[PDB]
């Protein structure tokens, strides 16, 4: 069961801002750019497809949502130095921030994906309490954007991502996720 917290395909997304898409070399932004980046990491991503599915089933989270964070956080490993982020604070495929969380397991194993998803799941739960009038789907998006900047940043539905990295964390990650549902996650 992977549908306890909402379904990614029902979320409304603007995709990647141009601060996210230009760096990567695209000439366009939004959902198209989001999906295109996502598609670039799929070969690499598919290297961990069994671990990403095991844990999503374990945690009642949608594997697409985990692949979306993994594509945005480290590019399914590609941009990491021994699982380290270039400023050295983030660790593993989901880039668990060591300042905030003592990292567990190896940078690309199940112990690491479980921990990243457990953190994701606590912020989703945190947003369900904060905003009970929202829909599950809306609380799932909130969770995802909180995953990057803290739940304190989720104040609203509509300007939740302002203050995240590139002002598009959950919009991006929600659009890459939708691409991975379409392709095996
Ligand atoms: C999973 C987790 O750690 N999420 C936390 C998130 O942290 C970001 C940092 C980034 C990252 O690693 N940046 C790269 C830095 S480096 O590699 O260049 O050095 N990877 C994480 C999600 O994107 O930041 C918060 C504080 O702003 C914490 O809210 S909190 O309120 O609970 O603090 C959330 O706990």
Swiss-Prot record:
Q: Where's the active site on this chain? A: 73
Q: Which reaction does it catalyse?
A: Hydrolysis of (1->4)-beta-linkages between N-acetylmuramic acid and N-acetyl-D-glucosamine residues in a peptidoglycan and between N-acetyl-D-glucosamine residues in chitodextrins
Q: Which residues form the signal peptide?
A: none
Metal-binding is among the record's keywords? no
Major subcellular location class: secreted
Q: List the disulfide bonds.
A: 4-60, 18-29
Q: List localization entries.
A: Secreted
Q: Which UniProt keywords apply?
A: Antimicrobial, Bacteriolytic enzyme, Disulfide bond, Glycosidase, Hydrolase, Secreted
Gene Ontology CC annotations of this record = extracellular region
Q: Which GO terms describe its molecular function?
A: lysozyme activity
Superkingdom: Eukaryota
Q: What else is known?
A: Shows preference for N-acetylmuramic acid residues that are substituted with a peptide moiety. It acts only as a glycanohydrolase.
- Give the family per the record: Belongs to the glycosyl hydrolase 23 family.
Protein name, entry field:
Lysozyme g
Q: Where is the organism placed in the taxonomic lineage, from the top? A: Eukaryota, Metazoa, Chordata, Craniata, Vertebrata
């Amino acid at each position: 069961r992977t549908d306890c917290y909402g379904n990614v395909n029902r979320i409304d997304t603007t995709g990647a801002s141009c601060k996210t898409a230009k760096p990567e070399g695209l000439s366009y932004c939004g959902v198209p750019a989001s999906k295109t980046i996502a598609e670039r990491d799929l070969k690499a991503m598919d290297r961990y497809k069994t671990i990403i599915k095991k844990v999503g089933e374990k945690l009642c989270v949608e594997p697409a949502v985990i692949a979306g964070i993994i594509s945005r956080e480290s590019h399914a490993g590609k941009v990491l130095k021994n699982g380290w982020g270039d400023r050295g604070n983030g660790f593993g495929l989901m880039q668990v921030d060591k300042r905030s969380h003592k990292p567990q397991g190896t940078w690309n194993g199940e112990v690491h994906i479980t921990q990243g998803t457990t953190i994701l799941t606590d912020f989703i739960k945190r947003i369900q309490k904060k905003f009970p009038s929202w829909t599950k789907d809306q609380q799932l998006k909130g969770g995802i954007s909180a995953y990057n900047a803290g739940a304190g940043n989720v104040r609203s539905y509509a300007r939740m991502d302002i203050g995240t990295t590139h002002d598009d964390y959950a919009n991006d990650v929600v659009a890459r996720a939708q691409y991975y549902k379409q392709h095996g996650y």
